[PDB]
Ligand binder design. Structure first.
Ligand code: NA
Ligand code: NA
Lengths: 282, 280
């Protein structure tokens, strides 16, 4: 990767992200703890869904995927643990699908597994909303592989890039499968209009992109907001990073105008995602 | 702000918007012609949908609303005229609902009517996608009236304002009811991810906001991007307006990376909306 690396800024940016969250969010993420029985159930369902694909995945690997759900949901407000388990399974199986060679992507085998998961854990209406979101995300992933549109949106400006990431980073899917956990009519509506996703996209994506940059550029991946700046130039990098923190701050201050429960969930998502992303486990 | 106006800029901004579309889109909108029978079918369904509200709407009002669909769809690519009629009806009855005293908003009576429209004109899955978009939009409006969240998103920055308008100005609804008109797999997916709405929100909202500004500020409505600048300050106004034209241009040039049918639809929507808005 040569000088296209954020390694020189890794510690300072980690410190600044945390400082920002401490100043602006205050409430520290907590990890939801599943019983051994609940985790086993989650993992069994994950294994079942990827079995048709001939994937064997260890518990260790599943638990490494699931941690983002354990850290980035909002334990204060959980009301439906069946829905919580659905989010665990769906998150994990999607990560596995995403890590597969796309030439092995058999949608005909995988999509009915997603449907079977949703029907197990959600009521009829919610199962359809979660399933459609999952189907929309994997379909978009397939459409945007080596696509000129992805190139155009990702390289034009931060505005076009984040617009693309509202779907691509997975947060619209996340919101559409997570609202049944909270049974909160306002949150449910913000999830369904995708306003929830639009509010949280930058705080999730900027953190994810920062910590994935070196790995991605080494693999020739273009979907990272830091590709819009000359990371090798400390002055240009610091300018850009400050602009991204300011974006995160503006979003967070606006999130604080939503009703209390909704803003707890949105902020626990953005902050919890950062805690997980930086964890030794991750 | 209550007595502000963009009247002094009306002619110049109209010319500039048109000049921009001529330079960046080139292909001009054309109006879909409904047969007499199709227009009567649309009007009859509109009337039926709003009848339970005790709402009496003139044919001329229906026609004034339906013109946005006739001008802003993409005639070169229309495949399914039943879907097209559904968008006519859904568009018109949502306008009428929007124009009513919200105290008269009986969702119990209105939502089953929207469901009936969707079930008449769309196949089963598309009927569900359209109805859910309609329901989300009208439920959103009800949640945001006088909400501190709307205030926050509309006054903070253009980024927050447009983010709110992806839903609030109706474009996500429009895409999710319009894809069955085209039956084009790529467009259908961009509509269902809402990328379609994200790409076209600024070009629709900046135009709608400019021409609705005087009416809206006089009614204390805060959902207008021009309230983010002092329209009484000519230099400030020109700077702001140029920034919004630059936003529209950037979205349009990015839209041209999409597949040809999809870009045709997106650009016909933004440019058609401008043509209808200026004639209505
Ligand atoms: Na948390
Ligand atoms: Na047109």
């Amino acid at each position: 990767i040569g000088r296209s690396s954020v390694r020189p800024y890794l510690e300072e940016c980690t410190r600044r992200f945390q400082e920002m969250f401490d100043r602006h969010v205050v409430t520290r993420p907590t990890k939801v703890e599943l019983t051994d029985a609940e985790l086993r159930e989650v993992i069994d369902d994950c294994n079942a869904a990827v079995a048709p694909l001939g994937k064997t995945v260890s518990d260790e690997r599943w638990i490494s995927y699931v941690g983002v759900v354990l850290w980035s949901q909002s334990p204060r407000h959980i009301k439906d643990m069946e829905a919580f388990k659905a989010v665990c399974v769906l998150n994990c199986v999607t990560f596995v699908w995403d890590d597969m060679d796309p030439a092995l992507h058999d949608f005909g085998l995988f999509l009915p597994q997603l449907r079977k998961i949703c029907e197990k854990y959600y009521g009829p209406e919610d199962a359809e909303v979660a399933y459609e979101a999952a189907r929309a995300l994997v379909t978009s992933d397939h459409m945007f592989r080596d696509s000129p549109i992805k190139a155009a949106l990702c390289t034009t400006s931060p505005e076009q890039y984040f617009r693309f990431r509202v779907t691509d980073i997975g947060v619209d899917f996340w919101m559409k499968m997570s609202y049944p956990i909270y049974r909160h009519p306002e949150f449910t509506e913000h999830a369904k209009t995708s306003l929830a996703a639009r509010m949280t996209t930058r705080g999730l994506t900027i953190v994810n992109d920062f910590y994935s940059y070196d790995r991605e550029v080494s693999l020739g991946q273009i979907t990272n907001c830091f590709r819009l700046c000359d990371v090798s130039d400390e002055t240009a990098f610091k300018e850009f990073f400050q602009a991204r923190l300011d974006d995160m701050i503006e979003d967070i201050e606006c999130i604080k105008a939503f009703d209390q429960l909704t803003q707890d969930v949105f902020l626990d998502l953005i902050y919890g995602n950062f805690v997980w992303t930086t964890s030794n486990k991750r």
